[PDB]
C-alpha cells in the first residue's frame, strides 16, 4: 500500500469508464437497450419514442 | 386532398398507420401537419346494384 495514492486515481478513472460502459446496457424505461432491436421490431413512430 | 374510402379504413388516414390504403394508396408523412376530415356518403356514393 505504498503507492496507494496513484492507484486510487487509476482505479477511480477505470471505474468511472466502466460505469459509463455499463450504462449502455440499461433501457431507461424503453423496451430494449439495443437500438437495432427497436429499429427492427417497431415502426419509426414508436421507435422514435 | 379529396377521395372516397371504406368506412372502417378512416383509421388508416393518419401518420404512422399501416394497411392497404396507407401503404398502397395514400401515405401520410410522420411529420404531417393539417387536418383529416371525413364523413359518411352512403346516400350519395352507393347504388342498389
Swiss-Prot record, chain A:
Source taxon at top rank: Viruses
Annotated effect of mutating residue 8 to N: In strain: Delta/B.1.617.2, Mu/B.1.621
Coiled coil: 7-49
Impact after mutating residue 27 to K: In strain: Omicron/BA.1, Omicron/BA.2, Omicron/BA.2.12.1, Omicron/BA.2.75, Omicron/BA.4, Omicron/BA.5, Omicron/BQ.1.1, Omicron/XBB.1.5, Omicron/EG.5.1
Resulting phenotype, residue 40 to A: In strain: Alpha/B.1.1.7
Mutagenesis or variant effect for residue 39 to F: In strain: Omicron/BA.1
Function description: Subunit of the fusion protein that is processed upon entry into the host cell. Mediates fusion of the virion and cellular membranes by functioning as a class I viral fusion protein. Contains a viral fusion peptide that is unmasked after S2 cleavage. This cleavage can occur at the cell membrane by host TMPRSS2 or during endocytosis by host CSTL. In either case, this triggers an extensive and irreversible conformational change that leads to fusion of the viral envelope with the cellular cytoplasmic membrane, releasing viral genomic RNA into the host cell cytoplasm.
Protein name: Spike protein S2'
Species annotation: Severe acute respiratory syndrome coronavirus 2 (2019-nCoV)
Residues of the full protein shown: 943 to 991 of 1273
Swiss-Prot record, chain B:
Domain of life where this protein originates: Viruses
Result of altering residue 49 to S: In strain: Omicron/BA.1, Omicron/BA.2.75, Omicron/XBB.1.5, Omicron/EG.5.1
Ranges for region Integrin-binding motif: 6-8
Outcome when changing residue 47 to T: In strain: Omicron/BQ.1.1
Resulting phenotype, residue 8 to N: In strain: Omicron/BA.2, Omicron/BA.2.12.1, Omicron/BA.2.75, Omicron/BA.4, Omicron/BA.5, Omicron/BQ.1.1, Omicron/XBB.1.5, Omicron/EG.5.1; complete loss of interaction with host integrins
Subunit (UniProt): Binds to host ACE2. RBD also interacts with the N-linked glycan on 'Asn-90' of ACE2. Cleavage of S generates a polybasic C-terminal sequence on S1 that binds to host Neuropilin-1 (NRP1) and Neuropilin-2 (NRP2) receptors. Interacts with host integrin alpha-5/beta-1 (ITGA5:ITGB1) and with ACE2 in complex with integrin alpha-5/beta-1 (ITGA5:ITGB1). May interact via cytoplasmic c-terminus with M protein. May interact (via N-terminus) with host bilirubin and biliverdin, thereby preventing antibody binding to the SARS-CoV-2 spike NTD via an allosteric mechanism.
Function: Attaches the virion to the cell membrane by interacting with host receptor, initiating the infection. The major receptor is host ACE2. When S2/S2' has been cleaved, binding to the receptor triggers direct fusion at the cell membrane. When S2/S2' has not been cleaved, binding to the receptor results in internalization of the virus by endocytosis using host TFRC and GRM2 and leading to fusion of the virion membrane with the host endosomal membrane. Alternatively, may use NRP1/NRP2 and integrin as entry receptors.
Protein name in the entry: Spike protein S1
Annotated source species: Severe acute respiratory syndrome coronavirus 2
Gene that this sequence comes from: S
Full-protein positions shown: 398 to 446 of 1273
Amino acid at each position: 500500500s505504498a503507492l496507494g495514492k496513484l492507484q486510487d486515481v487509476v482505479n477511480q478513472n477505470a471505474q468511472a469508464l466502466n460505469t459509463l460502459v455499463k450504462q449502455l446496457s440499461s433501457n431507461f424505461g424503453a423496451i430494449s437497450s439495443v437500438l437495432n432491436d427497436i429499429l427492427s421490431r417497431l415502426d419509426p413512430p414508436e421507435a422514435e419514442v | 386532398d379529396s377521395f372516397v374510402i371504406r368506412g372502417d379504413e378512416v383509421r388508416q388516414i393518419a401518420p404512422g398507420q399501416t394497411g392497404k390504403i396507407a401503404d398502397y394508396n395514400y401515405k401520410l408523412p410522420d411529420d404531417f401537419t393539417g387536418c383529416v376530415i371525413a364523413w359518411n356518403s352512403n346516400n350519395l356514393d352507393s347504388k342498389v346494384g
